[PDB]
Structure formats: structure tokens, C-alpha cells
Ligand binder design. Structure first.
Ligand SMILES: CN[C@@H](C)C(=O)N[C@H](C(=O)N1C[C@H]2C[C@@H]3C[C@@H]3N2C[C@H]1C(=O)N[C@@H]1CCOc2ccccc21)C1CCCCC1
Ligand SMILES: [Zn+2]
Length: 92
């Protein structure tokens, strides 16, 4: 999968075909936060920063996890704002 082909939400959604139903985070929330499914286990990558996330847990919010682990991502900042990212990074 080409990162460029994943710049739009609809394209990212279609990558989740065989996404394990047992994982307690849904494709719609993942795709909204920039992620697409790379086709192994529960591994997803962001189309913009290429950050990879896995081992989704109950109650995870994909935007929070994006800001926790990849705070410099420009798509994250454009969508959620620098204030949000600063707070997740523990700067109040
Ligand atoms: C609990 N919520 C989940 C989303 C979470 O926090 N996952 C963490 C994660 O995805 N991370 C951890 C961070 C730490 C550091 C910033 C780097 N990591 C990114 C990410 C990760 O493990 N990514 C792997 C390794 C790199 O390659 C890929 C490629 C695709 C998908 C995932 C990853 C890890 C996964 C392994 C179990 C423990 C939580
Ligand atoms: Zn990103």
C-alpha cells in the first residue's frame, strides 16, 4: 500500500476488510485519525507521518494515541491542533 493512495478517508476505510472484529477499536475511528490497515494482525500506519501503531486496547482513542506517540505529525496538528498535542505530551 502506497502512503499517497491513503491521503483520503474513503481510501483508508477500504483497507480494513479483514480487520479482526475482536479488536476493541473500530475502522471508522482509525481512518478518521489518519490510519490505514497494513494487513497484518492489528497494525496500522498513518498516511502522513508513517507512524505505526498496534495492540489496540479497550478505550483507546486513535487521536490520543497518535498524539502520544507521533506528536510532530502535521496531519494530527492540522486536525486536532497544537494545544491538544501539547496536553497529551503533558504540557499544560
Ligand atoms: C495501548 N494503545 C496502543 C495503540 C499502543 O500504545 N501501542 C504501542 C505502539 O503501537 N507503539 C509504541 C511506541 C513507542 C515508541 C514510539 C514508538 N512506538 C510506536 C508503536 C509501535 O510499537 N509501532 C510498531 C513498531 C514499529 O513498526 C510498526 C509498524 C506497524 C505497526 C506498528 C509498528 C505499543 C505496541 C506494542 C505493545 C505495547 C504498546
Ligand atoms: Zn501521523
Amino acid at each position: 500500500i502506497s502512503n499517497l493512495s491513503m491521503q483520503t478517508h474513503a481510501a483508508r476505510m477500504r483497507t480494513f476488510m479483514y480487520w479482526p472484529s475482536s479488536v476493541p477499536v473500530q475502522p471508522e475511528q482509525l481512518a478518521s485519525a489518519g490510519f490505514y490497515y497494513v494487513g497484518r494482525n492489528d497494525d496500522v500506519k498513518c498516511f502522513c507521518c508513517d507512524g505505526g501503531l498496534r495492540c489496540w486496547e479497550s478505550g483507546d482513542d486513535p487521536w490520543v494515541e497518535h498524539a502520544k506517540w507521533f506528536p510532530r505529525c502535521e496531519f494530527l496538528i492540522r486536525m486536532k491542533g497544537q494545544e491538544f498535542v501539547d496536553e497529551i505530551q503533558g504540557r499544560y
